[PDB]
Structure formats: structure tokens, C-alpha cells
Amino acid sequence: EETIARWMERGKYSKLLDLWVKGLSIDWNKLYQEEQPGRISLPTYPFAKESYWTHA
Amino acid sequence: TLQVGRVAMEERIAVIAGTMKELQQKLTAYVKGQEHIADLYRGQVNRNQEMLDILTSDDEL
């Protein structure tokens, strides 16, 4: 996790993303050492639309 | 000699031992089919070829 911290500081973004996409867990909060950006509305998960009903 | 004097091939095992008797014990357990042996590791390169390629490039590792 420290090695990641150093890759981020050094900006080895390509490396982190090549590892992240294979499953490497990354604490994205460490990306922001000073201050924090703001949350905004973005599209949400497009849940599968499958029908389910019973019988009366 | 086994570290530096043998080409590392596809099927590998490795054992940590502090005495000869311990090594003989662990290797004999391996020969006898024991699936789990303490401080004896089994695996294959053939399996993890992909992640190997992509991680060893950097001296970081």
C-alpha cells in the first residue's frame, strides 16, 4: 500500500491503472493529499430489467 | 548450486530447511504425494504467464 502511495506521488498512473484493472485494490482517497474535490451527480448503475410476478 | 547452477524450468518446487533431515523429510513427503507440506511450495509457471510478463519489467519490483 505504501508502494502504491509512492507510485501515485510519482504519478505512475499508467502502472496503477494497469494493476487496478486486474483487481489490485487502490485507496483512491490517497490521491488527494491536500483538500478534496466535490461530489457531483452522475448516471447510476443500469440495473438489469427482468420481470418477476406471482400468481393469485 | 541449486540456486545458481540449474536453469529454472516450468514446473518448480522450493523448500526451506535448516537441517538435512528436515529437507529429506519434506521432499520425501512430496514424493509420497502429500498435498500440503510446511515450507514447501508447489506451482507452475505455465499458469501465471500473463501477470509475470507485466510486473517484472519495472526495477520497482
**Which experimental technique did the depositors report for determining this structure?**
cryo-EM
Q: B40 has which bridge partners?
A: B15
User: Cα–Cα distance between B17 and B21 in angstroms, integer?
Assistant: 9
Q: Are B17 and B28 in contact (CB under 8 A)?
A: no
CA distances from A12 to A8, A33, A34, B3, B53 (A): 6, 16, 19, 33, 18
Instruction: Give the angle subtended at the CA of B56 by the CAs of B58 and A4, to the nearest 5°.
Output: 55
User: Cα–Cα distance between A46 and A38 in angstroms, integer?
Assistant: 23
The nearest alpha carbon in chain A to B58 belongs to: A15
Give which of B48, B50, B55 to mutate to test A binding, by max A Cβ within 10 Å. B55
DSSP chain A: -HHHHHHHHHT-HHHHHHHHTTT----GGGG-SSS---------------------
Cell, residue B28: 520425501
User: Cα–Cα distance between B29 and B21 in angstroms, integer?
Assistant: 12
Stated resolution in angstroms: 6.8
